Symmetry: C3
Subunit: 158 residues, 3 copies
């Protein structure tokens, strides 16, 4: 009954000449997310929520933007290592919920695929993983398609 | 078997619309474009998220939809334990309308006032929210199977 | 048991001429927040939220005193705090060096074991007012039980 909650936030710039990879899904698009790793904004947000619930710090502490080993890193592999460290700390994951905010492209056709990727990576059934997709209703840099934002929440139990 | 969900919503403030937040009509020169009840939408998504049922976009006034959301959450074998939320609006003042929002939500979710919370914030005049171009709502929901 | 969750948000403008205090920690920087401790307000708000006692505006000295009073009110409402998690979004300066001090400040104020308090740091990847260093945001989540 020793439950804990975590929350996560991530954002990356949307630039030409990068792969667009969200929830481990490679999505056809003229632009992609800029970062040190594969820049998977959704997976990073979830990774942060998990480290946070376990009180193990954050993704920057565990997988630094200034370490060559993670240059172009597969964020699913990073998520699986996160889950491993959370389990090592003594916690089991109960559920994950998340939101993705993007003006474009359409993400609804890819949501189930993202959900399946996360569930596999966390060794969870599909019914304990949720991914929600939204636009920013034309507001701000997100409305101008300058970047894509992700949010996450995770429940664990020690 | 507890589960948590998180919700986010934002809508533009436009002329010629009534301002309805948490089912409360608030006297204001502009309203949300979408009834575009940003708060109820954020709570709805948090509940769908906790029950792992997807989102509003996949599922669908906003009170009728929240009542339906709560129905589908119950359908999946989940009971709602609590809701917490935040409204971010630079204008107008939300303080006098909070208690009514809470009452509306508690009624729609078949919950005691005890387990529903609504919080109000400005955006310190920063960004589009600060300039009164939109209103953002955030929500968190705990459920049990 | 009777678990409840809360969430919190806070932002403050970042301008030269004021000190920078995040999580009860003064941080050397050319700008500060117009004590305006974004981290502690968000956590305070999350706690009132979980307890269903309203918000910081309804209830309320620097931000640590307010956090301390918040926790006393949560306790008397019949609730015990299980854990807190949070994120600070700030383009500059580097916050990672100061996380353990913040965690110590928050855990002391809430009378929690250190391993039940977490603080994360992000930049906004140069996007929006946050990414231009015009403001700093904090987010919080708190789990409580009655
Ligand atoms: Mg935001
Ligand atoms: Zn990232
Ligand atoms: Zn909406
Ligand atoms: Zn504040």
């Amino acid at each position: 009954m020793d439950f804990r909650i975590g929350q996560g936030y991530d954002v990356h710039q949307l630039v030409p000449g990068r792969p667009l990879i969200i929830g481990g899904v490679t999505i056809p698009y003229e632009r992609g997310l800029l970062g040190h790793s594969d820049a998977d904004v959704l997976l990073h947000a979830i990774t942060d929520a998990l480290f946070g619930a376990a009180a193990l710090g954050d993704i920057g502490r565990h997988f630094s933007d200034t370490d060559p080993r993670f240059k172009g890193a597969d964020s699913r592999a990073l998520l699986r290592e996160c889950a491993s460290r959370v389990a090592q700390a003594g916690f089991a994951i109960r559920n994950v919920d998340s939101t993705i905010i993007a003006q474009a492209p359409k993400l609804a056709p890819h949501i189930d695929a993202m959900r399946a990727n996360i569930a596999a990576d966390l060794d969870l059934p599909l019914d304990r993983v949720n991914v929600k997709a939204k636009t920013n209703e034309k507001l701000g840099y997100l409305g101008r398609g300058e970047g894509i934002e992700a949010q996450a929440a995770a429940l664990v139990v020690r």
